[PDB]
Amino acid sequence: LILMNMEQIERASDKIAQGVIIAYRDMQLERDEMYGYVNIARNLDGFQQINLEELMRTGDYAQITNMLLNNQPVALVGALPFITDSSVISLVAKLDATVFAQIVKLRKVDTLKPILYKINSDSNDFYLVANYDWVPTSTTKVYKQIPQQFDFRASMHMLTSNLTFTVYSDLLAFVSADTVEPINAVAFDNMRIMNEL
């Protein structure tokens, strides 16, 4: 049960994403009911995948460093903490593209914190989106899943059990156990254990 539901449980967490795609092309921000505009990736189709756990374990940063230096599109896969940035100015500053160079500097991946933009009317600078003609884009996307909606029909169950019972542990406490007088105790052969009397 745990193994089959692991992926669903992990993807429900609000503090880890499942990866980050660095695509040095300008990709439109998705329109998601949970965010407004969000640089969210539904899947990793179309990108080479670097497993972050394997990279941490090997210590060999040659391929990742070469790809980052040469701006080769890639998808870093692994449980990652992410920053939720609600500032349109941050997106225009393209700050989501500024977070990977520390990987090469330190040869670590445990401080990689990609930027997940969350642009909507609650952003202080949302008017820039509203009052100008332009498509909000970013060069990175965060591989994360969307929460499952509550559905009453799929959530209502009938649970059945017994009305009541009593569990017992000491079974031998239900047994009345006497012995014969030891003078009359017999062995397997039905004669008295001690017969010299």
Binding site: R153, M156, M158
Partner: protein
């Protein structure tokens, strides 16, 4: 009857409405009625009898009530309900078969099988709910002595009869005047034949009268009337009234004259149709009187004039016809008809279990014998078995 019908109707509603994925609110009232049925039937033993080859069957009812737990019904719920429904349908079908094969001379309207007599007990009256079918509604209205009627498409109201009356006859059967007729089901095909073509009639007119007394009163009847009788318009070799010899019939069809259809009730002229053909309406009648005249054509072409000489021998016998078809009517008593299966159902059950001939019905439930001698006791027994058969048809 009302309890048996209510059981059948509850089961039919359960089978049609307790379906996978249906809203709980589609079935709330049905679930209540079904649980009331289960509670009433629980702890009751029934025996469906061993008349004929119908096997003796024992029925025990210990069933759990249906729950009310899902917004949309699921397969588990339908499965439990279907198990209960199947057992109940088996029981109801057996009770219906058991009742359909019994009869009584005195109280033929009352239940006859042990199970239906038990279901008439006060304890089972709680099962009763909507009695909406034509037959159960007629049954309830008849128990209260209220006027009600069964609607029949092509009622089998005429006992089968294919015979003739000769008004002028000779040993050689060559100058014959009379009538042939087939009365079958909802059809009356009558014909009047004159071998001389009314050569010597007072005004060259021969009058033919056919009177058919209906065994029950019919109301609101739509009837088709057609001038000719196709069944008596071709040459025939017909047995004599005793069958000693056979005579010859060589019809030539002439237009019926002074056609008069009278529909009579209690001897009063309820409806009269003179020379009217096609669709006619007979309000309410128990007798049909068809009076038609063969009129020798005053002017004839030479071929026609040659068909009918002035004296014997006669070779081309002048025939006038009439065809009456009751297409649909209303009768206060149950009757066989072309659309319903009640008679066929009762007869099939009686034949398939070798039910011995009883003291009410003719052997084999023959409809001609039944309708010919349609006594009040036969009417009561037939209404009972037809209501039971219609209750059975809702499930089987």
């Amino acid at each position: 009857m009302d309890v048996l019908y209510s059981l059948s109707k509850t089961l039919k509603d359960a089978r049609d409405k307790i379906v996978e994925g249906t809203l709980y609110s589609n079935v709330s009232d049905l679930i209540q009625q079904f649980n009331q049925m289960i509670i009433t039937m629980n702890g009751n033993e029934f025996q469906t009898g061993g008349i004929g080859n119908l096997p003796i069957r024992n029925w025990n009812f210990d069933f759990g009530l249906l729950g009310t737990t899902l917004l949309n019904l699921d397969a588990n719920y339908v499965e439990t309900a279907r198990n209960t429904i199947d057992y109940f349908v088996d029981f109801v079908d057996n009770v219906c078969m058991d009742e359909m094969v019994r009869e009584s001379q005195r109280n033929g309207i009352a239940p006859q099988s042990d199970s239906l007599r038990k279901l008439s007990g006060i304890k089972f009256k709680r099962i009763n709910f909507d009695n909406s079918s034509e037959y159960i509604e007629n049954w309830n209205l008849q128990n209260r002595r209220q006027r009600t009627g069964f609607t029949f498409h092509k009622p089998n109201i005429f006992p089968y009869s294919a015979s003739f009356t000769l008004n002028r006859s000779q040993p050689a059967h060559d100058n014959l005047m009379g009538t042939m007729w087939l009365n079958a089901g909802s059809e009356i095909q009558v014909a009047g034949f004159d071998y001389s073509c009314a050569i010597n009639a007072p005004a060259n007119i021969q009058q033919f009268e056919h009177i058919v007394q209906l065994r029950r009163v019919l109301t609101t009847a739509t009837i088709t009337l057609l001038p000719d009788a196709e069944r008596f318009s071709f040459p025939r070799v017909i047995n004599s009234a005793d069958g000693a010899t056979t005579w010859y019939f060589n019809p030539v069809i002439l237009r019926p004259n002074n056609v008069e259809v009278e529909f009579l009730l209690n001897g009063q002229i309820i409806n009269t149709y003179q020379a009217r053909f096609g669709t006619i309406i007979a309000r309410n009648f128990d007798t049909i009187r068809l009076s038609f005249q063969l009129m020798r054509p005053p002017n004839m072409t030479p071929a026609v004039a040659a068909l009918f000489p002035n004296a014997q021998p006669f070779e081309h016998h002048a025939t006038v016809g009439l065809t009456l078809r009751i297409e649909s009517a209303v009768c206060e008593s149950v009757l066989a008809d072309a659309s319903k299966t009640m008679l066929a159902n009762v007869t099939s059950v009686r034949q398939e279990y070798a039910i011995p001939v009883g003291p009410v019905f003719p052997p084999g439930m023959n409809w001609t014998d039944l309708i010919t001698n349609y006594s009040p006791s036969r009417e009561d027994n037939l209404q009972r078995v037809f209501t039971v058969a219609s209750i059975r048809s809702m499930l089987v």
